[PDB]
Amino acid sequence: QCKILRCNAEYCRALRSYALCTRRTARTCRGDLAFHSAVHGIEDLMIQHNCS
Amino acid sequence: QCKILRCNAEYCRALRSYALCTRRTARTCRGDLAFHSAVHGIEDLMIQHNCS
Amino acid sequence: KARCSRKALHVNFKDMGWDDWIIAPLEYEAFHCEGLCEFPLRSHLEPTNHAVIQTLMNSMDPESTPPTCCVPTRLSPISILFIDSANNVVYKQYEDMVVESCGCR
Amino acid sequence: KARCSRKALHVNFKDMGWDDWIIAPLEYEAFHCEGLCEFPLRSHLEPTNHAVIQTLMNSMDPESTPPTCCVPTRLSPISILFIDSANNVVYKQYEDMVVESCGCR
């Protein structure tokens, strides 16, 4: 099963942890809207302010 | 079936119409929360401002 | 301002004049939902696809779409012993009476 | 300020960078919910008992409890043809994508 919600619990270091968690759970999420939405949110939060 | 929602469509004359509709549909509503809530609301709106 | 969560809501039937037909119980904890609905949506249960899409759109362009709202997503029933219109004492299990979890929709 | 009703919400997948994996459709009308939640609750479908109780309590003492919120109560699915992680073209029926009715909860 897709474990995208497990990454939202612990949540620029937090953004990297979120990204690593999404990478780890990217296998079972073949086509889930929450996964792509979380990826887009991580990207938007990394671009915002100043992160790298 | 309880027809309490049918009275909320047409809605101090409107308050009297609401009361008459609730009286008309009071048979099938043996114990429905929406019926008692609508009666309490009619009473609160009649007491408010100036109605009789 | 905190995220969407569950707060207290002590319903008292005597405060509504419903004690004339309700025998027991006369009060109970029903809870309610309140809190911010921001990105991402953190919830034990998975949000609806529409809620995800609308929250993402509000995160993108907040000027366009309004955010989702904190509302109950799971509820449990309670039993009520009351007197119906026929002067009968009825034990009825009313559904959707107690909020068990809140979410953004 | 009007009561709880359904408004437009044109979702465009190109605006979210999702066109890289979504083939069709690229945009659709998802609608959303907005409006006042006052007494009484006027809706084609019957509100939950908890929504009725909370709206009545807000009508009684608004200082105590916050009002209910306008959220979707019926939704319909849409079909999406996309490319999953295994380079396969999948036709999937995503549920809860289009709001068909709004209500106060």
Author numbering:
A (entry chain B), B (entry chain B): 36 to 46, 80 to 120
C (entry chain A), D (entry chain A): 397 to 501
Quote the passages of the study that discuss this structure, keeping the authors' original sentences.
We also determined the structures of the RGMAND–GDF5 and RGMCND–GDF5 complexes. However, while the GDF5 structure in the three complexes is largely invariant, the relative orientation of the three RGMND helix bundles towards GDF5 differs. The relative position of the α3 helix differs by ∼5 Å in RGMBND–GDF5 and RGMCND–GDF5 complexes, with its N terminus being the anchor point for a rotation of RGMND. The pivot point seems to be RGMB Leu103 (RGMA Leu97, RGMC Leu101). A relative rotation around this leucine permits the side-chain of the preceding arginine (Arg100 in RGMB) to be inserted between GDF5 fingers 1 and 2 in the RGMA– and RGMB–GDF5 complexes. In the RGMCND–GDF5 complex, however, this arginine side-chain is placed above finger 2, potentially explaining the different arrangements of the RGM α3 helix. Strikingly, the superposition of GDF5-bound RGMBND and RGMCND requires translation by 5.6 Å and rotation by 15.4°. Intriguingly, mutations in the α2–α3 linker of RGMC (Gly99Val, Gly99Arg, Leu101Pro) cause iron overload and impair interactions with the closely related BMP2 (17). GDF5 interacted similarly with RGMCND (Kd 3.9 μM) and weaker with RGMAND (Kd 16.7 μM). The juvenile hemochromatosis-causing mutation, Gly99Arg, in RGMCND and a corresponding mutation, Gly101Arg, in RGMBND attenuated the interactions with GDF5, Kd > 20 μM and > 150 μM, respectively.
